[PDB]
């Protein structure tokens, strides 16, 4: 005979925005991988990463020799014009995250000694990628090393 209480917040979650946040998210988290990152949020996070990268570069003793830097899209683009291209990027906060070596490239080329092919195979470039990533994880003044 008695009529139980009307449970309005569930109905507010129905009729305003037609879904149900109230269920344990362990269903969706355990079964389904997370949603892929869209646009907008990408541009905002890249802009914040550009600002954090500027402020992290002005503190560290950057190599002042020929490394002209462009913060272009979260990637500092350390490029000496003669020989070498580096792209660096921090992951988290400003103080304590190390650097990631997103793309390393060697600009030195002669199309005759290297027999019409690249001077250095991607195997060796990836090896130097691991070595410089390790010496970044040594956490000295990193850019000089």
């Amino acid at each position: 005979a008695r009529l139980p209480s009307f449970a309005i917040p569930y109905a507010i979650d129905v009729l305003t925005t037609g879904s149900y946040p109230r269920l344990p998210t362990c269903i969706r988290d355990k079964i389904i991988p997370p949603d892929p990152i869209t646009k907008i949020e990408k541009q905002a996070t890249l802009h914040q990463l550009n600002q954090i990268l500027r402020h992290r570069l002005v503190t560290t003793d950057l190599p002042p020799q020929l490394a002209n830097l462009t913060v272009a899209n979260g990637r500092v683009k350390f490029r000496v014009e003669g020989e070498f291209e580096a792209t660096l990027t921090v992951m988290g906060d400003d103080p304590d995250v190390p650097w990631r070596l997103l793309k390393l490239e060697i600009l030195v080329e002669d199309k005759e000694t290297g027999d019409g092919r690249a001077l250095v195979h991607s195997m060796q470039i990836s090896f130097i990628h691991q070595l410089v990533q390790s010496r970044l994880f040594a956490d000295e003044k990193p850019l000089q090393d």
């Binding site: 000694t113 290297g114 027999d115 092919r117 690249a118 001077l119 250095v120 195979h121 060796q124 090896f127 130097i128 691991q130 070595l131 390790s134 010496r135 994880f137 040594a138 090393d145």
Partner: peptide, 25 residues
């Protein structure tokens, strides 16, 4: 239901890079 055969010299240079700059975990 390659390798252009000038990689011996690059590899020796890689070993000299390993010695002159060691990896650091």
């Amino acid at each position: 239901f390659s390798s252009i055969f000038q990689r011996q010299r690059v590899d020796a240079l890689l070993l000299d890079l390993r010695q002159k700059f060691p990896p650091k975990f």
